Amino acid sequence: RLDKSKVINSALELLNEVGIEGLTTRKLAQKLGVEQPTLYWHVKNKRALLDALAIEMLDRHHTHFSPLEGESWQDFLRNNAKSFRNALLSHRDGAKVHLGTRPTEKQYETLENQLAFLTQQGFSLENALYALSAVGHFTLGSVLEDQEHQVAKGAEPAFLHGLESLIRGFEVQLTA
Amino acid sequence: RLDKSKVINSALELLNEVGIEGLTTRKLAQKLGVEQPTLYWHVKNKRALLDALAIEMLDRHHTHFSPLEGESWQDFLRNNAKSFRNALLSHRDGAKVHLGTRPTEKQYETLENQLAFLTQQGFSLENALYALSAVGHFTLGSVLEDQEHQVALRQAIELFGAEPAFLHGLESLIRGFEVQLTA
RNA sequence: GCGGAGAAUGUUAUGGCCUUCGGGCAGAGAAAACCG
């Protein structure tokens, strides 16, 4: 009856219906037509479920985490953020559920590959980490306030122009 | 005895001791030695308290929201973010409590003055607004990731305060703002 | 004392509850309550 694919897939849908704060493991159990002591074998508590949702939104939509070979470091940073953005825009309050999740080991591994690639293109290791953190921080902050300001009742162009302010600022600083 | 100056100071202290998630109007009443029906007369619920706490953290520490006499538009944006950052670092989870608070009428009015300042300095109004949202978003995002990841390549993690990423990152937008406006 | 029990209702506390009337209790893996 219940597999890993089924329970989070409905959890992804109920996250849209209710929101992160209103979300409860009990409403999920009732959504699946099951008792809670049974569902505990899949999700131990609410917090673990949020981790599973965060991992699953990144796996599905953050598809440009790696540079398509034959791509500039600029275009990589661009589309990495655009894919990272679209992943947090995939579901309601997507930035919050992604927020507060300890990262996995492959995410570290992907960071070394991200770090190595920029060093290959002339970056210093110091500036490589600063650069990667800056684009990520601005993308995360942009998505958070976007989804939060969307709780009150365009912002996409503000993200684009802001991202290019980082990139073409990265360009000039690399001139060394 | 109880004035809403004291309740904000103690709520800020309870905000530091307990955190945004644990912070509740009930614990604040216990901290002040009063019943909840008494405290309701000052702050109705948690959400009103969050706005009250957020506003005064900016009032205390966001002291460089205005361009200093005889200062570059560049240095303004740097010191604008640095003050906004220090305001969000003033208390525990300061970025989270600041998040989700819709702004005052004075803040809009302050932003229009900010917009005019950079527009007057050669910015287009469209690009003027983009710059301020970007620096704010990155500063907000930078502080959130910082505050979240403190309740916890080989050379890389070794070289990690979090301020240098903010400082170096902010200069990446301004040095990008400079080139982009030279057009 | 602790077993049914990761019990139920409920969320973000102007209220809901215990009290030996001094006071005490708790938030999505609640305070309570019942039942050996």
Numbering used by the authors:
A (entry chain B): 3 to 155, 181 to 203
B (entry chain A): 3 to 154, 170 to 177, 181 to 203
Could you pull the original sentences from the published paper?
Eponymous TetR is a homodimeric α-helical protein, and each monomer comprises 10 α-helices. The tertiary structure of TetR family members consists of two domains: an N-terminal nucleotide-binding domain (NBD) and a C-terminal effector-binding domain (EBD) that also contains the dimerization interface. In the absence of its natural ligand tc, TetR binds to the DNA tetO operator sequence and thereby represses downstream genes. Upon tc binding to the EBD, TetR undergoes an allosteric rearrangement that increases the separation of the NBDs, abolishes tetO operator binding and alleviates gene repression.
The apical GAAA tetraloop (nucleotides 22–25) could only be modelled in part. A crystal packing analysis suggested that no space is available for the placement of the central AA nucleotides. It is therefore possible that these nucleotides are absent in the crystal, most likely due to a random proteolytic degradation event. To further investigate this, a second TetR–aptamer complex was crystallized. The crystal structure of TetR in complex with a shortened 39-nucleotide-long TetR-binding RNA aptamer variant K2 was determined at 2.9 Å resolution. In this complex, nucleotides 2–37 could be modelled continuously, including the apical UUCG tetraloop of which the tip was missing in the previous structure. K2 shared 74% sequence identity with K1, and the overall fold of aptamer K2 was identical to that of aptamer K1. Apart from the fully formed apical tetraloop, the only two additional differences were a shortened 3 bp-long stem P1 and a likewise altered stem P2. Since all interactions between TetR and aptamer were identical in the K1 and K2 complexes and owing to the higher resolution of the TetR–RNA aptamer K1 complex, we limit ourselves to the description of the latter and refer to the K1 complex as the TetR–RNA aptamer complex from here on.
